[PDB]
Amino acid sequence: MPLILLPAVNVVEGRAVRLVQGKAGSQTEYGSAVDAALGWQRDGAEWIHLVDLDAAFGRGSNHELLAEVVGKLDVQVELSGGIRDDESLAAALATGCARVNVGTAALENPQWCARVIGEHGDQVAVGLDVQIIDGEHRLRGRDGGDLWDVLERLDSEGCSRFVVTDITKDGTLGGPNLDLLAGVADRTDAPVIASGGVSSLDDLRAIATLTHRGVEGAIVGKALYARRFTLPQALAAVRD
């Protein structure tokens, strides 16, 4: 039952955007979101994590592009970014994506969040952005509440899935936060998707040690562009 890898495609201005490591150093590279997604699929991705960063900041939507990516893909898409109300949720689902992620809305509109969880079940996952200040696990994103408190509320509301990021300043410095991942996974019956803190295959292997504990997958972002490993290498590293 291997860890599912979800290569990320981040979308700004209708284009894919990534932080890349070239020979000379880091820079921001744009490309076609279709190209990036199809590339991952051919590399062996069964899931793409598609993020509308314009929507995430209300600076626009890339709805038609998002739909084109979902449509052209033969594999499944998890869609995220600015999914906050009835209108934006409908629009996200209208892309034909397998499921969506709700984030800040869980901290901002708990009742709407509970309503859409009940309505859409497995089509809705909640992103938990966790800051760790002096031992305390807090939620924030774009204070936002106690992590364990909000996790319990969401678990009891029937939340089907959680996406867990440690956003603590320098908290993913020595690799992914397995304590937090295992922390969340132990407190809910819902599967947990790891996001952030991945810079190597070893980081993925480490996350993979928690599959039997409820860590279903890992979103892989810029690490795929760091010229350290390929998606096929990553997929192979977690299956064996």
Short mmCIF file of N, CA and C in Angstrom, two decimals, residues 40-152:
data_model
loop_
_atom_site.label_atom_id
_atom_site.label_comp_id
_atom_site.label_asym_id
_atom_site.label_seq_id
_atom_site.Cartn_x
_atom_site.Cartn_y
_atom_site.Cartn_z
N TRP A 40 4.16 14.88 -15.60
CA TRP A 40 4.07 14.10 -14.39
C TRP A 40 3.36 12.78 -14.65
N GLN A 41 2.26 12.85 -15.40
CA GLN A 41 1.48 11.68 -15.75
C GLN A 41 2.31 10.64 -16.49
N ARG A 42 3.06 11.06 -17.51
CA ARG A 42 3.94 10.16 -18.25
C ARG A 42 5.06 9.61 -17.36
N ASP A 43 5.53 10.44 -16.41
CA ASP A 43 6.52 10.02 -15.43
C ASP A 43 5.97 8.95 -14.47
N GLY A 44 4.64 8.84 -14.42
CA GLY A 44 3.96 7.78 -13.66
C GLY A 44 3.01 8.25 -12.57
N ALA A 45 2.77 9.56 -12.48
CA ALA A 45 1.86 10.11 -11.48
C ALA A 45 0.45 9.55 -11.65
N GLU A 46 -0.15 9.13 -10.54
CA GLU A 46 -1.54 8.71 -10.54
C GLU A 46 -2.41 9.86 -10.05
N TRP A 47 -1.78 10.86 -9.43
CA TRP A 47 -2.47 12.03 -8.90
C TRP A 47 -1.62 13.24 -9.18
N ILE A 48 -2.29 14.35 -9.51
CA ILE A 48 -1.65 15.65 -9.67
C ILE A 48 -2.26 16.56 -8.61
N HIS A 49 -1.43 17.34 -7.93
CA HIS A 49 -1.94 18.34 -7.01
C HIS A 49 -1.90 19.68 -7.71
N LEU A 50 -3.07 20.14 -8.13
CA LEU A 50 -3.19 21.32 -8.95
C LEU A 50 -3.65 22.49 -8.07
N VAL A 51 -2.85 23.55 -8.03
CA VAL A 51 -3.14 24.69 -7.17
C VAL A 51 -3.35 25.95 -7.99
N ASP A 52 -4.49 26.60 -7.79
CA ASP A 52 -4.72 27.92 -8.36
C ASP A 52 -4.21 28.98 -7.38
N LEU A 53 -3.00 29.48 -7.61
CA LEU A 53 -2.41 30.48 -6.72
C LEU A 53 -3.04 31.86 -6.87
N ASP A 54 -3.60 32.15 -8.05
CA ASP A 54 -4.36 33.39 -8.24
C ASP A 54 -5.63 33.39 -7.40
N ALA A 55 -6.32 32.25 -7.39
CA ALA A 55 -7.54 32.10 -6.60
C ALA A 55 -7.20 32.15 -5.12
N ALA A 56 -6.09 31.51 -4.76
CA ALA A 56 -5.61 31.48 -3.38
C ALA A 56 -5.42 32.88 -2.80
N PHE A 57 -5.24 33.87 -3.67
CA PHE A 57 -5.09 35.26 -3.25
C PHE A 57 -6.15 36.20 -3.85
N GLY A 58 -7.20 35.62 -4.43
CA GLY A 58 -8.31 36.39 -5.03
C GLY A 58 -7.86 37.35 -6.12
N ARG A 59 -6.71 37.04 -6.71
CA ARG A 59 -6.10 37.90 -7.72
C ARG A 59 -6.60 37.51 -9.10
N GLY A 60 -7.41 36.46 -9.13
CA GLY A 60 -7.98 35.95 -10.37
C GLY A 60 -8.32 34.49 -10.23
N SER A 61 -8.89 33.93 -11.28
CA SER A 61 -9.10 32.49 -11.34
C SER A 61 -8.57 31.99 -12.67
N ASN A 62 -8.15 30.73 -12.67
CA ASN A 62 -7.65 30.07 -13.86
C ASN A 62 -8.56 28.90 -14.19
N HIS A 63 -9.86 29.13 -14.03
CA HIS A 63 -10.86 28.07 -14.07
C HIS A 63 -10.83 27.26 -15.35
N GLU A 64 -10.85 27.94 -16.50
CA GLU A 64 -10.90 27.25 -17.79
C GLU A 64 -9.62 26.44 -18.05
N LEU A 65 -8.49 26.96 -17.59
CA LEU A 65 -7.22 26.25 -17.72
C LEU A 65 -7.22 25.01 -16.83
N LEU A 66 -7.65 25.19 -15.59
CA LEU A 66 -7.79 24.11 -14.64
C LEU A 66 -8.63 22.96 -15.22
N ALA A 67 -9.75 23.30 -15.86
CA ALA A 67 -10.61 22.32 -16.50
C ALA A 67 -9.91 21.59 -17.66
N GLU A 68 -9.13 22.34 -18.43
CA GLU A 68 -8.36 21.79 -19.55
C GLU A 68 -7.31 20.80 -19.04
N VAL A 69 -6.69 21.09 -17.91
CA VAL A 69 -5.70 20.19 -17.34
C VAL A 69 -6.38 18.90 -16.88
N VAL A 70 -7.45 19.04 -16.10
CA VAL A 70 -8.21 17.89 -15.62
C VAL A 70 -8.73 17.05 -16.78
N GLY A 71 -9.22 17.72 -17.82
CA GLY A 71 -9.78 17.04 -18.97
C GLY A 71 -8.75 16.24 -19.76
N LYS A 72 -7.61 16.87 -20.03
CA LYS A 72 -6.53 16.25 -20.81
C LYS A 72 -5.84 15.11 -20.06
N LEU A 73 -5.79 15.20 -18.74
CA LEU A 73 -5.19 14.15 -17.94
C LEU A 73 -6.06 12.90 -17.96
N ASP A 74 -5.42 11.74 -17.83
CA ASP A 74 -6.13 10.48 -17.68
C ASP A 74 -6.13 10.05 -16.24
N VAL A 75 -5.39 10.78 -15.41
CA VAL A 75 -5.28 10.45 -14.00
C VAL A 75 -6.04 11.49 -13.19
N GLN A 76 -5.97 11.35 -11.87
CA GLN A 76 -6.83 12.13 -11.00
C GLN A 76 -6.18 13.39 -10.51
N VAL A 77 -7.01 14.41 -10.33
CA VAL A 77 -6.54 15.72 -9.91
C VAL A 77 -7.16 16.09 -8.58
N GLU A 78 -6.31 16.53 -7.66
CA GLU A 78 -6.71 17.20 -6.45
C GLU A 78 -6.49 18.70 -6.64
N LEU A 79 -7.58 19.46 -6.55
CA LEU A 79 -7.54 20.89 -6.85
C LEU A 79 -7.62 21.74 -5.58
N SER A 80 -6.78 22.75 -5.50
CA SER A 80 -6.74 23.62 -4.34
C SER A 80 -6.61 25.08 -4.74
N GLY A 81 -6.95 25.97 -3.80
CA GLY A 81 -6.68 27.39 -3.98
C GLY A 81 -7.93 28.24 -4.04
N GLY A 82 -8.15 29.01 -2.97
CA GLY A 82 -9.27 29.92 -2.89
C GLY A 82 -10.65 29.29 -2.87
N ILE A 83 -10.74 28.02 -2.46
CA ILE A 83 -12.03 27.34 -2.38
C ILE A 83 -12.64 27.64 -1.02
N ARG A 84 -13.56 28.60 -0.99
CA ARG A 84 -13.97 29.27 0.25
C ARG A 84 -15.47 29.39 0.46
N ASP A 85 -16.23 29.35 -0.62
CA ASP A 85 -17.68 29.50 -0.54
C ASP A 85 -18.38 28.65 -1.59
N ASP A 86 -19.70 28.72 -1.64
CA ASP A 86 -20.51 27.97 -2.60
C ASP A 86 -20.09 28.17 -4.05
N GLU A 87 -19.83 29.42 -4.41
CA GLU A 87 -19.51 29.79 -5.78
C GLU A 87 -18.15 29.23 -6.19
N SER A 88 -17.15 29.39 -5.33
CA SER A 88 -15.80 28.92 -5.65
C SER A 88 -15.72 27.39 -5.56
N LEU A 89 -16.48 26.79 -4.65
CA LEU A 89 -16.52 25.32 -4.56
C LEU A 89 -17.13 24.71 -5.82
N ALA A 90 -18.30 25.21 -6.21
CA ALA A 90 -18.94 24.77 -7.45
C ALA A 90 -17.99 24.89 -8.64
N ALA A 91 -17.29 26.02 -8.74
CA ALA A 91 -16.39 26.27 -9.84
C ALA A 91 -15.25 25.26 -9.84
N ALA A 92 -14.69 24.98 -8.66
CA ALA A 92 -13.64 23.99 -8.53
C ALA A 92 -14.12 22.59 -8.95
N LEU A 93 -15.30 22.19 -8.49
CA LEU A 93 -15.81 20.88 -8.86
C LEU A 93 -16.16 20.84 -10.35
N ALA A 94 -16.55 21.99 -10.90
CA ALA A 94 -16.93 22.08 -12.30
C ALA A 94 -15.75 21.85 -13.25
N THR A 95 -14.53 21.86 -12.70
CA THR A 95 -13.34 21.51 -13.49
C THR A 95 -13.31 20.01 -13.79
N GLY A 96 -14.11 19.24 -13.05
CA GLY A 96 -14.13 17.80 -13.18
C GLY A 96 -13.06 17.09 -12.38
N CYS A 97 -12.41 17.83 -11.47
CA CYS A 97 -11.35 17.27 -10.64
C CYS A 97 -11.91 16.22 -9.69
N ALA A 98 -11.07 15.24 -9.35
CA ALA A 98 -11.48 14.14 -8.47
C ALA A 98 -11.87 14.67 -7.09
N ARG A 99 -11.02 15.52 -6.51
CA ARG A 99 -11.34 16.17 -5.26
C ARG A 99 -10.71 17.55 -5.13
N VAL A 100 -11.23 18.32 -4.18
CA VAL A 100 -10.73 19.65 -3.91
C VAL A 100 -10.14 19.71 -2.50
N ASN A 101 -9.29 20.71 -2.27
CA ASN A 101 -8.82 21.04 -0.94
C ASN A 101 -9.40 22.39 -0.50
N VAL A 102 -9.94 22.39 0.71
CA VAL A 102 -10.39 23.58 1.39
C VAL A 102 -9.32 23.89 2.46
N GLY A 103 -8.92 25.15 2.58
CA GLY A 103 -7.86 25.53 3.52
C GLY A 103 -8.28 26.56 4.54
N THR A 104 -8.00 27.83 4.24
CA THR A 104 -8.33 28.96 5.11
C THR A 104 -9.80 29.02 5.51
N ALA A 105 -10.67 28.49 4.65
CA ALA A 105 -12.11 28.46 4.89
C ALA A 105 -12.47 27.69 6.16
N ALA A 106 -11.64 26.70 6.51
CA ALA A 106 -11.85 25.87 7.70
C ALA A 106 -11.64 26.66 8.98
N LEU A 107 -10.80 27.69 8.88
CA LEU A 107 -10.49 28.56 10.00
C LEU A 107 -11.40 29.78 10.01
N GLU A 108 -11.98 30.09 8.86
CA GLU A 108 -12.68 31.35 8.63
C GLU A 108 -14.19 31.14 8.62
N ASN A 109 -14.62 30.03 8.04
CA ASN A 109 -16.04 29.70 7.95
C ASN A 109 -16.31 28.23 8.32
N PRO A 110 -16.20 27.89 9.62
CA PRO A 110 -16.31 26.49 10.04
C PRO A 110 -17.63 25.83 9.64
N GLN A 111 -18.72 26.60 9.66
CA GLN A 111 -20.05 26.04 9.37
C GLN A 111 -20.23 25.71 7.89
N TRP A 112 -19.84 26.63 7.01
CA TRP A 112 -19.81 26.36 5.58
C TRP A 112 -18.95 25.13 5.31
N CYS A 113 -17.82 25.06 5.99
CA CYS A 113 -16.89 23.96 5.86
C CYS A 113 -17.52 22.61 6.26
N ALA A 114 -18.27 22.60 7.36
CA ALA A 114 -18.95 21.39 7.85
C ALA A 114 -20.07 20.95 6.90
N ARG A 115 -20.71 21.94 6.28
CA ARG A 115 -21.82 21.74 5.35
C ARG A 115 -21.33 21.04 4.08
N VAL A 116 -20.23 21.54 3.53
CA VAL A 116 -19.70 21.01 2.28
C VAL A 116 -18.98 19.67 2.46
N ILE A 117 -18.44 19.42 3.65
CA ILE A 117 -17.90 18.10 4.00
C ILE A 117 -19.02 17.06 3.97
N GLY A 118 -20.14 17.37 4.64
CA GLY A 118 -21.32 16.51 4.65
C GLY A 118 -21.90 16.29 3.26
N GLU A 119 -21.87 17.33 2.44
CA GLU A 119 -22.44 17.28 1.10
C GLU A 119 -21.57 16.46 0.14
N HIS A 120 -20.26 16.68 0.18
CA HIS A 120 -19.37 16.18 -0.86
C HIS A 120 -18.43 15.06 -0.43
N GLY A 121 -18.39 14.78 0.87
CA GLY A 121 -17.63 13.66 1.41
C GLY A 121 -16.21 13.59 0.91
N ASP A 122 -15.91 12.55 0.13
CA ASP A 122 -14.55 12.28 -0.35
C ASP A 122 -14.04 13.28 -1.40
N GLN A 123 -14.93 14.13 -1.90
CA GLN A 123 -14.52 15.16 -2.84
C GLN A 123 -13.89 16.37 -2.16
N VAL A 124 -14.01 16.45 -0.83
CA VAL A 124 -13.47 17.58 -0.08
C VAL A 124 -12.43 17.13 0.95
N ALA A 125 -11.21 17.65 0.81
CA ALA A 125 -10.19 17.49 1.82
C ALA A 125 -9.90 18.84 2.44
N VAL A 126 -9.40 18.85 3.67
CA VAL A 126 -9.07 20.09 4.34
C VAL A 126 -7.57 20.22 4.53
N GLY A 127 -7.03 21.36 4.14
CA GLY A 127 -5.62 21.66 4.35
C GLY A 127 -5.42 22.27 5.71
N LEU A 128 -4.50 21.69 6.47
CA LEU A 128 -4.14 22.21 7.77
C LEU A 128 -2.72 22.78 7.72
N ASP A 129 -2.62 24.10 7.85
CA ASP A 129 -1.32 24.78 7.86
C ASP A 129 -0.90 25.05 9.31
N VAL A 130 0.08 24.29 9.78
CA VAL A 130 0.42 24.27 11.20
C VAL A 130 1.69 25.04 11.54
N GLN A 131 1.54 26.04 12.40
CA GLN A 131 2.67 26.77 12.96
C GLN A 131 2.91 26.27 14.38
N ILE A 132 4.18 26.01 14.70
CA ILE A 132 4.54 25.53 16.03
C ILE A 132 5.35 26.59 16.77
N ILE A 133 4.67 27.26 17.71
CA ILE A 133 5.26 28.31 18.53
C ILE A 133 5.32 27.83 19.97
N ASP A 134 6.53 27.77 20.52
CA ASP A 134 6.76 27.31 21.89
C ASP A 134 5.96 26.06 22.24
N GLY A 135 6.01 25.05 21.38
CA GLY A 135 5.32 23.78 21.61
C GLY A 135 3.87 23.72 21.16
N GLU A 136 3.19 24.87 21.16
CA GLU A 136 1.77 24.95 20.78
C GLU A 136 1.57 24.75 19.28
N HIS A 137 0.59 23.93 18.91
CA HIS A 137 0.24 23.69 17.51
C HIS A 137 -0.92 24.58 17.08
N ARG A 138 -0.59 25.61 16.30
CA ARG A 138 -1.58 26.59 15.86
C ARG A 138 -1.86 26.46 14.37
N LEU A 139 -3.08 26.79 13.97
CA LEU A 139 -3.44 26.87 12.56
C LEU A 139 -3.46 28.31 12.09
N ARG A 140 -2.97 28.52 10.87
CA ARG A 140 -3.02 29.83 10.22
C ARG A 140 -3.20 29.60 8.73
N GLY A 141 -2.99 30.65 7.94
CA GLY A 141 -3.00 30.51 6.49
C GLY A 141 -3.65 31.68 5.76
N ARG A 142 -2.81 32.49 5.12
CA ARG A 142 -3.24 33.55 4.19
C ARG A 142 -4.03 34.70 4.83
N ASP A 143 -4.72 34.96 14.72
CA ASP A 143 -4.51 33.51 14.78
C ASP A 143 -5.64 32.76 14.08
N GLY A 144 -5.54 31.43 14.02
CA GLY A 144 -6.52 30.61 13.31
C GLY A 144 -7.06 29.43 14.09
N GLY A 145 -6.65 29.30 15.36
CA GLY A 145 -7.17 28.23 16.21
C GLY A 145 -6.17 27.15 16.57
N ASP A 146 -6.48 26.41 17.62
CA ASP A 146 -5.67 25.29 18.09
C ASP A 146 -5.82 24.14 17.10
N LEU A 147 -4.69 23.53 16.72
CA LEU A 147 -4.71 22.46 15.73
C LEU A 147 -5.56 21.28 16.19
N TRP A 148 -5.30 20.79 17.40
CA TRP A 148 -5.97 19.60 17.92
C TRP A 148 -7.48 19.82 18.07
N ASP A 149 -7.84 21.00 18.57
CA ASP A 149 -9.23 21.44 18.67
C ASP A 149 -9.93 21.41 17.31
N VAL A 150 -9.33 22.06 16.31
CA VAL A 150 -9.94 22.15 14.98
C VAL A 150 -9.95 20.79 14.28
N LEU A 151 -8.88 20.03 14.47
CA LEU A 151 -8.79 18.67 13.94
C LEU A 151 -9.92 17.77 14.46
N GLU A 152 -10.17 17.83 15.76
CA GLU A 152 -11.26 17.07 16.39
C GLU A 152 -12.64 17.49 15.86
#
